[PDB]
């Protein structure tokens, strides 16, 4: 239609800027990264945003609300993703044997 | 901290079905989630492989388990190589 073609345009053309993530990663490493790191790390974070919004619209469709996304559907989105291990936290030393 | 992903993330939520005009608080939650994800991946990458260096190989091992993200990384790298060859 005429909205699906505009939505497909924003699904492809949108990206995080490489001039800021290279500034963001290098504040964590200390020295330097490469261009093929920033190209991949800018691409995984678009999949991760698409992992949340496609699942936060499943929270909103499950409850009785409309397309505008309140934060109620967004804290619930991170809760359901974390219970399936999708959201990694490297500060919680987990233990499976008890 | 200011918001470094305020205008970029509003295009992306529209790209996955949200609205043309999302809420500022929802955009803020998404920006915080993206920063936390990038930080976690960078620490694990520094630990795995070459200590103190984050490489594409380390990032690929870390994302190997999740199918959607692994496929995207492989496609982007292959397309980048192809574009360099075309140039």
């Amino acid at each position: 239609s005429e909205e699906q073609l505009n939505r497909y345009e924003m699904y492809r053309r949108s990206a995080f800027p490489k001039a800021a993530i290279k500034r963001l990663i290098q504040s964590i490493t200390g020295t330097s990264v490469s261009q093929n790191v920033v190209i991949a790390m800018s691409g995984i974070s678009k999949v991760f945003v698409g992992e949340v919004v496609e699942e936060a619209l499943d929270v909103c469709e499950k409850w009785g609300e409309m397309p505008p996304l309140q934060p109620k559907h967004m804290r619930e989105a991170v809760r359901r993703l974390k219970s399936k291990g999708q959201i990694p936290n490297s500060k919680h030393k987990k233990i499976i044997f008890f | 901290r200011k918001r470094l992903f305020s205008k970029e993330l509003r295009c992306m939520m529209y790209g996955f079905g949200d609205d043309q005009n999302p809420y500022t608080e929802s955009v803020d939650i998404l920006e915080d989630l993206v920063i936390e994800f990038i930080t976690e991946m960078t620490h694990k990458a520094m630990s795995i492989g070459r200590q103190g260096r984050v490489q594409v190989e380390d990032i690929v091992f870390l994302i190997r388990k999740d199918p959607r993200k692994f496929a995207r990384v492989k496609d982007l790298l292959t397309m980048n190589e192809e574009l360099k060859r075309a140039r």
Binding site: M10, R13, Q70 | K7, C11, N21, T24, E25
Partner: peptide, 26 residues
């Protein structure tokens, strides 16, 4: 020179269509 000016035109239309009014929520 063609790659340098055309890169910012994919993002310039990404500030005219999406996000016209800024909302909030209780």
């Amino acid at each position: 020179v063609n790659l340098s000016e055309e890169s910012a035109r994919i993002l310039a239309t990404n500030s005219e269509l999406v996000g016209t009014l800024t909302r909030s929520c209780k």
